[PDB]
Amino acid sequence: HPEVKIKTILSLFLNINIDDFNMDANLADAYDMDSTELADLAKEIEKEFGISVTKSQFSHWETGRAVLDFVSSSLNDK
Amino acid sequence: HPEVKIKTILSLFLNINIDDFNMDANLADAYDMDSTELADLAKEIEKEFGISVTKSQFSHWETGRAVLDFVSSSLND
């Protein structure tokens, strides 16, 4: 259930109730996510799923759905 | 899917890969969880699920499964 894992990781990272996280919301708009925070999020994703993420890759994470699609593709290849 | 949420929270909390987390393992033995950390975990659970947890309730969180079953029954309530 990669969607639930991602939703949970993003919710914890942003200090919000899991029920309140919107996977389709723009992260910068909805949660005030900045590029420094994306880098920190990427490090948690790398550890929790055991995958590599480049700066170029995490720079395109505009929504939770985008993070999910990246992690899904990475896990399939792994 | 409360089990997946709990496994993910515990894995992040304890700095381990989600696929490596054993929901039935004793948290103190397997992951060196002490009472200070347990209190901090309870604060995260309270925030993430929007529930109350007392010290007497979280003291029984000996495994990830205990956390799961507590949260599940709290959410039903």
JSON list of C-alpha atoms in Angstrom, two decimals:
[
{"chain": "A", "resi": 1, "resn": "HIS", "atom": "CA", "xyz": [0.00, 0.00, 0.00]},
{"chain": "A", "resi": 2, "resn": "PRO", "atom": "CA", "xyz": [2.46, 2.67, -1.19]},
{"chain": "A", "resi": 3, "resn": "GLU", "atom": "CA", "xyz": [-0.24, 5.40, -1.17]},
{"chain": "A", "resi": 4, "resn": "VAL", "atom": "CA", "xyz": [-0.91, 4.95, 2.57]},
{"chain": "A", "resi": 5, "resn": "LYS", "atom": "CA", "xyz": [2.83, 4.90, 3.40]},
{"chain": "A", "resi": 6, "resn": "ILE", "atom": "CA", "xyz": [3.43, 8.13, 1.46]},
{"chain": "A", "resi": 7, "resn": "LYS", "atom": "CA", "xyz": [0.38, 9.82, 2.96]},
{"chain": "A", "resi": 8, "resn": "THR", "atom": "CA", "xyz": [1.64, 8.85, 6.41]},
{"chain": "A", "resi": 9, "resn": "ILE", "atom": "CA", "xyz": [5.22, 10.03, 5.79]},
{"chain": "A", "resi": 10, "resn": "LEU", "atom": "CA", "xyz": [4.03, 13.39, 4.41]},
{"chain": "A", "resi": 11, "resn": "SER", "atom": "CA", "xyz": [1.57, 13.85, 7.29]},
{"chain": "A", "resi": 12, "resn": "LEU", "atom": "CA", "xyz": [4.27, 13.22, 9.91]},
{"chain": "A", "resi": 13, "resn": "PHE", "atom": "CA", "xyz": [6.78, 15.40, 8.11]},
{"chain": "A", "resi": 14, "resn": "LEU", "atom": "CA", "xyz": [4.31, 18.32, 7.90]},
{"chain": "A", "resi": 15, "resn": "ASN", "atom": "CA", "xyz": [3.01, 17.82, 11.47]},
{"chain": "A", "resi": 16, "resn": "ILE", "atom": "CA", "xyz": [-0.61, 17.32, 10.41]},
{"chain": "A", "resi": 17, "resn": "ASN", "atom": "CA", "xyz": [-3.36, 14.80, 11.13]},
{"chain": "A", "resi": 18, "resn": "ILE", "atom": "CA", "xyz": [-3.19, 11.90, 8.64]},
{"chain": "A", "resi": 19, "resn": "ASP", "atom": "CA", "xyz": [-6.91, 12.41, 7.83]},
{"chain": "A", "resi": 20, "resn": "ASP", "atom": "CA", "xyz": [-6.15, 16.01, 6.86]},
{"chain": "A", "resi": 21, "resn": "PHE", "atom": "CA", "xyz": [-3.47, 15.30, 4.25]},
{"chain": "A", "resi": 22, "resn": "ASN", "atom": "CA", "xyz": [-4.56, 15.87, 0.63]},
{"chain": "A", "resi": 23, "resn": "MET", "atom": "CA", "xyz": [-2.45, 13.83, -1.81]},
{"chain": "A", "resi": 24, "resn": "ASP", "atom": "CA", "xyz": [-3.55, 16.02, -4.75]},
{"chain": "A", "resi": 25, "resn": "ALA", "atom": "CA", "xyz": [-2.83, 19.40, -3.13]},
{"chain": "A", "resi": 26, "resn": "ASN", "atom": "CA", "xyz": [0.13, 21.49, -4.24]},
{"chain": "A", "resi": 27, "resn": "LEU", "atom": "CA", "xyz": [2.60, 20.99, -1.36]},
{"chain": "A", "resi": 28, "resn": "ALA", "atom": "CA", "xyz": [3.97, 24.56, -1.40]},
{"chain": "A", "resi": 29, "resn": "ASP", "atom": "CA", "xyz": [0.46, 26.08, -1.49]},
{"chain": "A", "resi": 30, "resn": "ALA", "atom": "CA", "xyz": [-1.35, 23.78, 0.95]},
{"chain": "A", "resi": 31, "resn": "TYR", "atom": "CA", "xyz": [1.46, 23.04, 3.45]},
{"chain": "A", "resi": 32, "resn": "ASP", "atom": "CA", "xyz": [3.99, 25.85, 2.81]},
{"chain": "A", "resi": 33, "resn": "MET", "atom": "CA", "xyz": [6.61, 23.31, 1.71]},
{"chain": "A", "resi": 34, "resn": "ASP", "atom": "CA", "xyz": [9.89, 24.93, 0.55]},
{"chain": "A", "resi": 35, "resn": "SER", "atom": "CA", "xyz": [12.89, 23.44, -1.32]},
{"chain": "A", "resi": 36, "resn": "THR", "atom": "CA", "xyz": [14.92, 23.00, 1.89]},
{"chain": "A", "resi": 37, "resn": "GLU", "atom": "CA", "xyz": [12.05, 20.93, 3.31]},
{"chain": "A", "resi": 38, "resn": "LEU", "atom": "CA", "xyz": [11.81, 18.85, 0.10]},
{"chain": "A", "resi": 39, "resn": "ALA", "atom": "CA", "xyz": [15.46, 17.89, 0.53]},
{"chain": "A", "resi": 40, "resn": "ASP", "atom": "CA", "xyz": [14.75, 16.77, 4.13]},
{"chain": "A", "resi": 41, "resn": "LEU", "atom": "CA", "xyz": [11.64, 14.88, 2.98]},
{"chain": "A", "resi": 42, "resn": "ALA", "atom": "CA", "xyz": [13.70, 13.18, 0.27]},
{"chain": "A", "resi": 43, "resn": "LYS", "atom": "CA", "xyz": [16.17, 11.90, 2.93]},
{"chain": "A", "resi": 44, "resn": "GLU", "atom": "CA", "xyz": [13.27, 10.31, 4.88]},
{"chain": "A", "resi": 45, "resn": "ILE", "atom": "CA", "xyz": [11.88, 8.73, 1.69]},
{"chain": "A", "resi": 46, "resn": "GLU", "atom": "CA", "xyz": [15.35, 7.34, 0.89]},
{"chain": "A", "resi": 47, "resn": "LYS", "atom": "CA", "xyz": [15.68, 5.75, 4.35]},
{"chain": "A", "resi": 48, "resn": "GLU", "atom": "CA", "xyz": [12.12, 4.44, 4.73]},
{"chain": "A", "resi": 49, "resn": "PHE", "atom": "CA", "xyz": [11.89, 2.82, 1.27]},
{"chain": "A", "resi": 50, "resn": "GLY", "atom": "CA", "xyz": [15.61, 2.10, 0.69]},
{"chain": "A", "resi": 51, "resn": "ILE", "atom": "CA", "xyz": [15.84, 4.02, -2.60]},
{"chain": "A", "resi": 52, "resn": "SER", "atom": "CA", "xyz": [18.04, 6.74, -4.10]},
{"chain": "A", "resi": 53, "resn": "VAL", "atom": "CA", "xyz": [16.67, 10.21, -4.88]},
{"chain": "A", "resi": 54, "resn": "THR", "atom": "CA", "xyz": [18.55, 12.98, -6.73]},
{"chain": "A", "resi": 55, "resn": "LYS", "atom": "CA", "xyz": [18.08, 16.73, -6.32]},
{"chain": "A", "resi": 56, "resn": "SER", "atom": "CA", "xyz": [16.62, 16.90, -9.84]},
{"chain": "A", "resi": 57, "resn": "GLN", "atom": "CA", "xyz": [14.10, 14.17, -8.94]},
{"chain": "A", "resi": 58, "resn": "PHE", "atom": "CA", "xyz": [12.80, 15.62, -5.65]},
{"chain": "A", "resi": 59, "resn": "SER", "atom": "CA", "xyz": [12.63, 19.13, -7.19]},
{"chain": "A", "resi": 60, "resn": "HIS", "atom": "CA", "xyz": [9.63, 17.87, -9.26]},
{"chain": "A", "resi": 61, "resn": "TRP", "atom": "CA", "xyz": [7.63, 16.71, -6.21]},
{"chain": "A", "resi": 62, "resn": "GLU", "atom": "CA", "xyz": [4.82, 19.26, -6.45]},
{"chain": "A", "resi": 63, "resn": "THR", "atom": "CA", "xyz": [2.12, 17.07, -4.80]},
{"chain": "A", "resi": 64, "resn": "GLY", "atom": "CA", "xyz": [1.98, 13.96, -2.60]},
{"chain": "A", "resi": 65, "resn": "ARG", "atom": "CA", "xyz": [0.76, 12.10, -5.69]},
{"chain": "A", "resi": 66, "resn": "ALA", "atom": "CA", "xyz": [4.04, 13.04, -7.45]},
{"chain": "A", "resi": 67, "resn": "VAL", "atom": "CA", "xyz": [6.04, 11.60, -4.52]},
{"chain": "A", "resi": 68, "resn": "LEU", "atom": "CA", "xyz": [3.91, 8.43, -4.67]},
{"chain": "A", "resi": 69, "resn": "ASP", "atom": "CA", "xyz": [4.43, 7.99, -8.43]},
{"chain": "A", "resi": 70, "resn": "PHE", "atom": "CA", "xyz": [8.19, 8.38, -8.05]},
{"chain": "A", "resi": 71, "resn": "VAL", "atom": "CA", "xyz": [8.36, 5.91, -5.14]},
{"chain": "A", "resi": 72, "resn": "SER", "atom": "CA", "xyz": [6.13, 3.39, -6.98]},
{"chain": "A", "resi": 73, "resn": "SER", "atom": "CA", "xyz": [8.38, 3.50, -10.07]},
{"chain": "A", "resi": 74, "resn": "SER", "atom": "CA", "xyz": [11.54, 3.25, -7.93]},
{"chain": "A", "resi": 75, "resn": "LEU", "atom": "CA", "xyz": [10.24, 0.23, -5.99]},
{"chain": "A", "resi": 76, "resn": "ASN", "atom": "CA", "xyz": [9.19, -1.58, -9.21]},
{"chain": "A", "resi": 77, "resn": "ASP", "atom": "CA", "xyz": [12.73, -1.12, -10.61]},
{"chain": "A", "resi": 78, "resn": "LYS", "atom": "CA", "xyz": [14.25, -2.24, -7.28]},
{"chain": "B", "resi": 1, "resn": "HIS", "atom": "CA", "xyz": [-5.36, 0.52, 6.56]},
{"chain": "B", "resi": 2, "resn": "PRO", "atom": "CA", "xyz": [-4.40, 1.45, 10.15]},
{"chain": "B", "resi": 3, "resn": "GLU", "atom": "CA", "xyz": [-1.74, -1.30, 10.28]},
{"chain": "B", "resi": 4, "resn": "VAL", "atom": "CA", "xyz": [0.20, 0.27, 7.38]},
{"chain": "B", "resi": 5, "resn": "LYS", "atom": "CA", "xyz": [-0.05, 3.74, 8.97]},
{"chain": "B", "resi": 6, "resn": "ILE", "atom": "CA", "xyz": [1.22, 2.43, 12.31]},
{"chain": "B", "resi": 7, "resn": "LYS", "atom": "CA", "xyz": [4.08, 0.42, 10.74]},
{"chain": "B", "resi": 8, "resn": "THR", "atom": "CA", "xyz": [5.10, 3.55, 8.82]},
{"chain": "B", "resi": 9, "resn": "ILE", "atom": "CA", "xyz": [4.99, 5.82, 11.91]},
{"chain": "B", "resi": 10, "resn": "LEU", "atom": "CA", "xyz": [6.97, 3.33, 14.01]},
{"chain": "B", "resi": 11, "resn": "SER", "atom": "CA", "xyz": [9.52, 2.79, 11.23]},
{"chain": "B", "resi": 12, "resn": "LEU", "atom": "CA", "xyz": [10.10, 6.52, 10.80]},
{"chain": "B", "resi": 13, "resn": "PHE", "atom": "CA", "xyz": [10.25, 7.02, 14.54]},
{"chain": "B", "resi": 14, "resn": "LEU", "atom": "CA", "xyz": [12.85, 4.27, 15.04]},
{"chain": "B", "resi": 15, "resn": "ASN", "atom": "CA", "xyz": [14.83, 5.14, 11.89]},
{"chain": "B", "resi": 16, "resn": "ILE", "atom": "CA", "xyz": [14.39, 1.84, 10.12]},
{"chain": "B", "resi": 17, "resn": "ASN", "atom": "CA", "xyz": [13.26, 0.73, 6.66]},
{"chain": "B", "resi": 18, "resn": "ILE", "atom": "CA", "xyz": [9.46, 0.16, 6.64]},
{"chain": "B", "resi": 19, "resn": "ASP", "atom": "CA", "xyz": [9.96, -3.37, 5.21]},
{"chain": "B", "resi": 20, "resn": "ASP", "atom": "CA", "xyz": [12.20, -4.25, 8.18]},
{"chain": "B", "resi": 21, "resn": "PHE", "atom": "CA", "xyz": [9.72, -3.36, 10.91]},
{"chain": "B", "resi": 22, "resn": "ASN", "atom": "CA", "xyz": [8.34, -6.32, 12.86]},
{"chain": "B", "resi": 23, "resn": "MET", "atom": "CA", "xyz": [4.93, -5.39, 14.34]},
{"chain": "B", "resi": 24, "resn": "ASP", "atom": "CA", "xyz": [5.09, -8.32, 16.79]},
{"chain": "B", "resi": 25, "resn": "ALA", "atom": "CA", "xyz": [8.60, -7.67, 18.14]},
{"chain": "B", "resi": 26, "resn": "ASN", "atom": "CA", "xyz": [9.13, -6.29, 21.63]},
{"chain": "B", "resi": 27, "resn": "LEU", "atom": "CA", "xyz": [10.02, -2.62, 20.99]},
{"chain": "B", "resi": 28, "resn": "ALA", "atom": "CA", "xyz": [12.55, -2.41, 23.86]},
{"chain": "B", "resi": 29, "resn": "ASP", "atom": "CA", "xyz": [14.38, -5.60, 22.75]},
{"chain": "B", "resi": 30, "resn": "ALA", "atom": "CA", "xyz": [14.26, -5.20, 18.97]},
{"chain": "B", "resi": 31, "resn": "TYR", "atom": "CA", "xyz": [14.60, -1.42, 18.61]},
{"chain": "B", "resi": 32, "resn": "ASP", "atom": "CA", "xyz": [16.07, -0.24, 21.97]},
{"chain": "B", "resi": 33, "resn": "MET", "atom": "CA", "xyz": [12.88, 1.73, 22.75]},
{"chain": "B", "resi": 34, "resn": "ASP", "atom": "CA", "xyz": [13.13, 3.29, 26.23]},
{"chain": "B", "resi": 35, "resn": "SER", "atom": "CA", "xyz": [10.40, 5.00, 28.30]},
{"chain": "B", "resi": 36, "resn": "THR", "atom": "CA", "xyz": [11.42, 8.55, 27.21]},
{"chain": "B", "resi": 37, "resn": "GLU", "atom": "CA", "xyz": [11.12, 7.55, 23.55]},
{"chain": "B", "resi": 38, "resn": "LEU", "atom": "CA", "xyz": [7.81, 5.81, 24.25]},
{"chain": "B", "resi": 39, "resn": "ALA", "atom": "CA", "xyz": [6.36, 9.05, 25.65]},
{"chain": "B", "resi": 40, "resn": "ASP", "atom": "CA", "xyz": [7.59, 10.89, 22.50]},
{"chain": "B", "resi": 41, "resn": "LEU", "atom": "CA", "xyz": [6.02, 8.23, 20.28]},
{"chain": "B", "resi": 42, "resn": "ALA", "atom": "CA", "xyz": [2.72, 8.66, 22.14]},
{"chain": "B", "resi": 43, "resn": "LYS", "atom": "CA", "xyz": [2.80, 12.40, 21.39]},
{"chain": "B", "resi": 44, "resn": "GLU", "atom": "CA", "xyz": [3.25, 11.62, 17.67]},
{"chain": "B", "resi": 45, "resn": "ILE", "atom": "CA", "xyz": [0.40, 9.12, 17.75]},
{"chain": "B", "resi": 46, "resn": "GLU", "atom": "CA", "xyz": [-1.85, 11.66, 19.51]},
{"chain": "B", "resi": 47, "resn": "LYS", "atom": "CA", "xyz": [-1.05, 14.25, 16.83]},
{"chain": "B", "resi": 48, "resn": "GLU", "atom": "CA", "xyz": [-1.26, 11.97, 13.79]},
{"chain": "B", "resi": 49, "resn": "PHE", "atom": "CA", "xyz": [-4.54, 10.33, 14.75]},
{"chain": "B", "resi": 50, "resn": "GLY", "atom": "CA", "xyz": [-6.12, 13.12, 16.86]},
{"chain": "B", "resi": 51, "resn": "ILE", "atom": "CA", "xyz": [-6.60, 10.93, 19.95]},
{"chain": "B", "resi": 52, "resn": "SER", "atom": "CA", "xyz": [-5.74, 11.16, 23.65]},
{"chain": "B", "resi": 53, "resn": "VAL", "atom": "CA", "xyz": [-3.27, 8.75, 25.26]},
{"chain": "B", "resi": 54, "resn": "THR", "atom": "CA", "xyz": [-2.39, 8.57, 28.97]},
{"chain": "B", "resi": 55, "resn": "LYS", "atom": "CA", "xyz": [0.87, 7.24, 30.44]},
{"chain": "B", "resi": 56, "resn": "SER", "atom": "CA", "xyz": [-0.99, 4.21, 31.83]},
{"chain": "B", "resi": 57, "resn": "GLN", "atom": "CA", "xyz": [-2.29, 3.43, 28.31]},
{"chain": "B", "resi": 58, "resn": "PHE", "atom": "CA", "xyz": [1.00, 3.89, 26.39]},
{"chain": "B", "resi": 59, "resn": "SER", "atom": "CA", "xyz": [2.98, 1.97, 29.04]},
{"chain": "B", "resi": 60, "resn": "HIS", "atom": "CA", "xyz": [1.27, -1.15, 27.59]},
{"chain": "B", "resi": 61, "resn": "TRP", "atom": "CA", "xyz": [2.67, -0.46, 24.08]},
{"chain": "B", "resi": 62, "resn": "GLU", "atom": "CA", "xyz": [5.14, -3.31, 24.24]},
{"chain": "B", "resi": 63, "resn": "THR", "atom": "CA", "xyz": [4.95, -4.06, 20.50]},
{"chain": "B", "resi": 64, "resn": "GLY", "atom": "CA", "xyz": [3.85, -2.20, 17.37]},
{"chain": "B", "resi": 65, "resn": "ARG", "atom": "CA", "xyz": [0.72, -4.37, 17.36]},
{"chain": "B", "resi": 66, "resn": "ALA", "atom": "CA", "xyz": [-0.26, -2.96, 20.79]},
{"chain": "B", "resi": 67, "resn": "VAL", "atom": "CA", "xyz": [-0.01, 0.57, 19.38]},
{"chain": "B", "resi": 68, "resn": "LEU", "atom": "CA", "xyz": [-2.13, -0.50, 16.40]},
{"chain": "B", "resi": 69, "resn": "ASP", "atom": "CA", "xyz": [-4.87, -2.12, 18.47]},
{"chain": "B", "resi": 70, "resn": "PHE", "atom": "CA", "xyz": [-5.02, 0.85, 20.84]},
{"chain": "B", "resi": 71, "resn": "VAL", "atom": "CA", "xyz": [-5.33, 3.33, 17.96]},
{"chain": "B", "resi": 72, "resn": "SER", "atom": "CA", "xyz": [-7.94, 1.15, 16.17]},
{"chain": "B", "resi": 73, "resn": "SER", "atom": "CA", "xyz": [-10.20, 0.99, 19.24]},
{"chain": "B", "resi": 74, "resn": "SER", "atom": "CA", "xyz": [-9.65, 4.75, 19.91]},
{"chain": "B", "resi": 75, "resn": "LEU", "atom": "CA", "xyz": [-10.70, 5.62, 16.33]},
{"chain": "B", "resi": 76, "resn": "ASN", "atom": "CA", "xyz": [-13.82, 3.44, 16.62]},
{"chain": "B", "resi": 77, "resn": "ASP", "atom": "CA", "xyz": [-14.62, 5.47, 19.75]}
]
